[PDB]
Paper text:
There is one major structural difference between the structure of AC9–C4–M and that of AC9–Gαs determined previously: [name] does not appear to stablise the occluded state, in which the C2b domain of AC9 displaces the nucleotide and forskolin from their binding sites at the C1a/C2a domain interface. The structure of AC9–C4–M revealed density in the active site consistent with the presence of [name]-GTP, as well as a lack of any density in the allosteric site. The binding of [name] to the C2a domain of AC9 leads to a small rearrangement of the C1a domain (RMSD ~1.2 Å), particularly prominent at the flexible “claw” region (β6α5β7β8) of C1a domain. Close to the “claw” region, the helix α4 in the AC9–C4–M structure also moves outward (RMSD ~1.7 Å) compared to AC9.
Adenylyl cyclase 9 (AC9) is a membrane-bound enzyme that converts ATP into cAMP. The enzyme is weakly activated by forskolin, fully activated by the G protein Gαs subunit and is autoinhibited by the AC9 C-terminus. Each membrane AC contains two conserved cytosolic catalytic domains and twelve predicted transmembrane (TM) helices, with cytosolic N- and C-termini of varied lengths and regulatory roles. Here, we present the cryo-EM structures of AC9 in several distinct states: (i) AC9 bound to a nucleotide inhibitor [name]-GTP, (ii) bound to an artificial activator ([name]) and [name]-GTP, (iii) bound to [name] and a nucleotide analogue ATPαS, (iv) bound to Gαs and [name]-GTP.
Author numbering:
A (entry chain B): 9 to 136
B (entry chain A): 97 to 197, 217 to 262, 278 to 359, 384 to 552, 566 to 574, 780 to 939, 976 to 1250
The structure:
Amino acid sequence: HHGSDLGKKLLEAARAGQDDEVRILMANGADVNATDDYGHTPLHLAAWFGHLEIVEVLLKAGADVNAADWLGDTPLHLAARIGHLEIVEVLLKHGADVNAQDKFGKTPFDLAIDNGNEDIAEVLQKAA
Amino acid sequence: SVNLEEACMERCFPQTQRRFRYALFYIGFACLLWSIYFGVHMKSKLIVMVAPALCFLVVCVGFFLFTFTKLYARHYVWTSLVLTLLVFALTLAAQFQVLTPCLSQVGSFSMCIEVLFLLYTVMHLPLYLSLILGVAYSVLFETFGYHHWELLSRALLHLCIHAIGIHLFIMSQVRSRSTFLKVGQSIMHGKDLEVEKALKERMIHSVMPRIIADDLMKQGDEESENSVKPFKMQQIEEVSILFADIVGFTKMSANKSAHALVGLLNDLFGRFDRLCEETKCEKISTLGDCYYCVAGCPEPRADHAYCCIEMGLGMIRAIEQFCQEKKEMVNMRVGVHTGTVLCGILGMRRFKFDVWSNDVNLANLMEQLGVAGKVHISEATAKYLDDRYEMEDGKVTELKTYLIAGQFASATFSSLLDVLLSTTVFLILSITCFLRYGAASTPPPPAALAVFGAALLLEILSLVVSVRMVFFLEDVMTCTKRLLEWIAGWLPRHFIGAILVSLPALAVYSHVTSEFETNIHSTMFTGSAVLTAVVQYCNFCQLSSWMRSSLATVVGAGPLLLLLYVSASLIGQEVILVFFLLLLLVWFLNREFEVSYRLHYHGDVEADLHRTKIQSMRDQADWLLRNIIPYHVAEQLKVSQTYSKNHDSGGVIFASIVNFSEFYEENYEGGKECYRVLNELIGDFDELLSKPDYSSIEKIKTIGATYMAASGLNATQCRDGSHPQEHLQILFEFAKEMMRVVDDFNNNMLWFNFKLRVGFNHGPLTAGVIGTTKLLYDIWGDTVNIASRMDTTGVECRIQVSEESYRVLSKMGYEFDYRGTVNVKGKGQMKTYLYPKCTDSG
């Protein structure tokens, strides 16, 4: 970008969950789909930390729905391997993909079974 | 520079002989057209001239057919001397028989100028010598033109024509030197660059097997071979994982010459390479008292296990034939095990080709459970033993295993030089043109002083242009320089120079506008001077050829075909002949010289090409060296056959990724990208290694996912300015820092914190180098396997430390918590500590 630190601080905000700082950086026009060195997106840092309110303020900022990390895993794969159903729902409403897979060859659905997160594995049985 | 600048002329010969051949031809044509002139138009009243003409013709063609002879290849100097003296005499004699009133002095002067040239350009005569001959000829001819102004006017014409003579000389001489020299350097680079290719290929293939380096030496994906100033990993099934450790190594390595064991070991391993090449198996690495190859990795072989096992058996014969040779009876345990393995490369520093799987550690274990002399094979191996050997259900004497016992001259220097030339000679030319004035005291004609001033202006400003593009004094402003010179490119130079060397012809034309022909001395004179000026059109050679020469023709001669229309009568005919032939000269002479400059520019392009190409290959291959071997030690095989050395204190640390083995789960096909992540951190480690505060640290290699480090070894120069015991301190500091590094790394790794267990020892060691026609570095001694067992039995996130290293670092000040005194193989109990203090709740 052109001074993509407003996006870097955006990444740290989406990760640690700095609520008002999100609003501030999006007021600062921060790079909504800025990524780290490892391809992670604010959705990646969010699902890791479970700030669903911040997930939604980022959706106000407007990042991607099916972005994957440099490790090919989307935050759908993350949340499958996490267990926060309520955070999963907002992306199915945002139109996530059901039949895709990460660079590891399994549909993110089975990643719920990775932790046995049947809460979200159920949600992924509904759509196709 | 004598013996060399002999071969120089010995190489530049055939062009010189070509020039001689053409000059001969031209002399022929000139004397002959003189003859037909004298035999038809005028001078039908004597043979005193024409028989000399034809005799000169025939002696010339005699030289001409001569030039192919063998007792001339070293005598072109003396041959030219002969010919030039001959033509000297010819011209002067065909001159003296004048000054009665029917052969003009201008014709004599054409002869003078032209022979003076073909003395300068083509003769290839020594500078001093061609010079003295030029001036002697000059003065003598002008005297034989004598038998208070006009005389010295003609003398000045001689002077200027000698000027352009010598300048033209030294220019052509240094040019055909420089091109020779650059072609010399170019061929040096040809051979030197093939050589560096060979060396770089050697080193590369001594770090990766055949197929992979063959694959990556075509650089089909140009972005991968940028780490060589990245790579791909592949998983292969049905492999043969052979091992070996020197049984009782410490004992058979109790006391050696720090070189003896080195050498004999080199011997054994060269043997084992000689074995694998026959079994077509890929040797892989050597861990100290160990060694191991693999098989079936690049090409899974139908009988990969067979080549492997029979190769091992051959190693048994090799080891016994050396034990009963140098009288040291230590064979080696052998563990063989099949299965699947993902191979590839990791790291960017000291990185090497390697392999990873459970099967890897499995074969190592089956080695540890292997009996000295025989192999503890697996059932995964036995699945196609085809029962052709000594199969025995070898089990631990304490799963599905068996025991088998067998059976100058810069193209901008030329600019200032030849513009100096044009300006000074135009100067003295117009000096003459004025010097005609003894009858009209103040110089009347207006166009004269007009063009004189105009030329003075242009020449002096352009000369200053050049002197400041050369010596860069910056009188007034500097940014303006980069702006205006910028214009003077390939074409603007064209036209500035066109005007710049045209101006002396116009100089001489300024004085002629008057009616003068009534005096025929003035016409004779101005004819002489215009032919001088037209000869000045040879100098500016960094310009075009056809253009500059056609400008010569037109704007030197055309106006004399114009004063052909002042009708001073048939002197017109003699002048059109002399200019016809003189112009023939200037044409072919000039085009030849532009060939010379063209070729010199080319032969500097190409030498620069190979210059940067050798620099590319040199940085590449030398840095590849520093990839494999450190520099200080890099001297000793560059200069000798081998190297070895003892260090009595060097810290060694392993570091593995234990919880990788879990997050290894191969739900992803191949697990490759997990190893990509490992490699990520390995890089992040090399990133450390390149730090100068990390100077004394040396990664030794990367085994599995481990990390071998050492220190206190390179910097032998004990200066007053340090405390030698520092190396362990900065070492362990680096250790703690990379420990923080894996943490930082894990802040990024999704929902996984990869933890590392680290061991330690310090003390004596042996540095050594193994491969020849290959290369490998390594260390031995107590300390290596000591710390190896340490981190083999360490607890993660807590730096295990050897007791005496614990002591030296405690007396350095570092905080440690006791771990336990656990038995050490071959050593007994040993007090272990951990560095992390209250890192956990316990």
